[PDB]
């Protein structure tokens, strides 16, 4: 069931976003992590049901929160990886796992860019 969970998600998502997320990372900035993540972020804050189901959103305009299990699902990237990226591209974990949720920030990460 941890797979079909993927289905409903990717599926109920606009083909463009998906497409985005599917492309391997190149030197192109809107192809590496941050962007890809961030597009979802702001996409979601636009369609609440999904913001709930996936569990990825802005707490403040500087900090945000997610259920890794789930974002790493949408992004087709394993959980392990997803964490590995978060610290590797320097994101700050500022509140240990609180029942699935975590909140984060990154100096360049915010509002819209």
Partner DNA sequence: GTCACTTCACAT
Partner DNA sequence: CATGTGAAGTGA
Strands 92-93 and 102-105: antiparallel
Helix (H, G, I), strand (E, B) or coil at 65: strand
Q: What gap in Å lies between CA 101 and CA 90, rounded to an integer? A: 19
- Can residue 104 be called a binding residue for DNA (CB under 7 A)? no
Q: What gap in Å lies between CA 95 and CA 101, rounded to an integer? A: 9
- Mark the segment that binds DNA (CB under 7 A) among 10-18, 44-52, 58-66, 96-104: 96-104
38 is in an annotated binding site: yes
For DNA, the binding residue among 44, 50, 56, 86 (CB under 7 A) is 86
Selection from 100, 66, 111, 113 nearest residue 86 by Cα = 66
CB closer to DNA out of 48 and 79 = 79
DSSP 104: E
- Can residue 70 be called a binding residue for DNA (CB under 7 A)? no
- Can residue 87 be called a binding residue for DNA (CB under 7 A)? yes
Residue ranges for the known binding site are: 6, 38
Residue ranges for the known binding site for Zn(2+) are: 6, 38
Give residues in contact with DNA (CB under 7 A): 23-27, 31-34, 68, 75-81, 83-89, 93, 96-97, 100, 102
């Amino acid at each position: 069931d941890s797979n079909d969970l993927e289905a409903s998600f990717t599926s109920r998502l606009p083909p463009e976003i998906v497409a985005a997320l599917k492309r391997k990372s190149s030197r192109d900035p809107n192809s590496r992590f941050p962007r890809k993540l961030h597009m979802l972020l702001t996409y979601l804050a636009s369609n609440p049901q999904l913001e709930e189901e996936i569990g990825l959103s802005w707490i403040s305009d500087t900090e945000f929160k997610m259920k890794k299990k789930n974002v790493a699902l949408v992004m087709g990237i394993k959980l392990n990886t997803l964490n590995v990226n978060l610290r590797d591209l320097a994101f700050e974990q500022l509140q240990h796992d609180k029942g699935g949720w975590t909140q984060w920030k990154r100096s360049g990460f915010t509002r819209n860019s």
